[PDB]
Amino acid sequence: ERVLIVNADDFGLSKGQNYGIIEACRNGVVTSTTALVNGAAIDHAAQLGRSTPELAVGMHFVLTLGEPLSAMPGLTRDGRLGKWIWQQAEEDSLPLEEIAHELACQYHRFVELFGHEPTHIDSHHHVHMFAQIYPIVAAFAREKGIALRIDRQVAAQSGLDQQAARSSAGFSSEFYGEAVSEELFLQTLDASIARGERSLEVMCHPAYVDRIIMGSAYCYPRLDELDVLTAASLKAAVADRGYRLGTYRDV
Ligand SMILES: [Zn+2]
DSSP: OEEEEEEEEEETSOHHHHHHHHHHHHTSSOOEEEEOTTOTTHHHHHHHHHHOTTSEEEEEEOSSSSOOSSOOTTTOBTTBOOTTHHHHHHTTOOOHHHHHHHHHHHHHHHHHHHSSOOSEEEEGGGGGGSTTTHHHHHHHHHHHTOEEOOOHHHHHHTTOOTTSSOOOSEEEOOSOSTTOOHHHHHHHHHHHHHTTOSEEEEEEOOOOOOHHHHTSSSOTHHHHHHHHHHOHHHHHHHHHTTEEEOOGGGO
């Protein structure tokens, strides 16, 4: 009747995150994950994905963290990606062709790593929701016949096409922080329901802690997210609300 997609971002970031996502899926409500095809532990993530058919995998398009697959002289500094892209976007100085080519390269490498088309595309730091990147990424997803994470409030603030590609009816980025709880997760569900949404994607970041995660400002809350997502109470509350646990393939 309703479909709930619970998507863990940043598959491939680190081995500890990889094991947190697998655990949140095998013993929790995580149904989906999106992978950094350039991540330090991407080959490790791909071995787990191949062994865990019950986990759907999409592509975490990334323009701000690793090294790109293709040469992007209009974007990289000392060969690396980084967070200057926000200012570069507002100065209308994005190398949009380089970006489109890197999107195609990350897609090609995704299929090599995992042996299937990604169920959908989202992005590290939500860069695919930038006004000038969104129509490129959505046209790509439409072209490939796959879905897109669509933050509908961001799209509406930026005049973007809500139908640019197939997606869930709504998306929530509100399940995060130090105060993560079962309550918080369920509040995003009940808020989606009141908006009249028949499907919802809920972002999350479960992980076991390793030295890579310890280098992030968001570290130990990932353990709390893992705890919430694997509690027996949560599956009951999801079912209680008429949700079927699902993936972007259902859209
Ligand atoms: Zn991310």
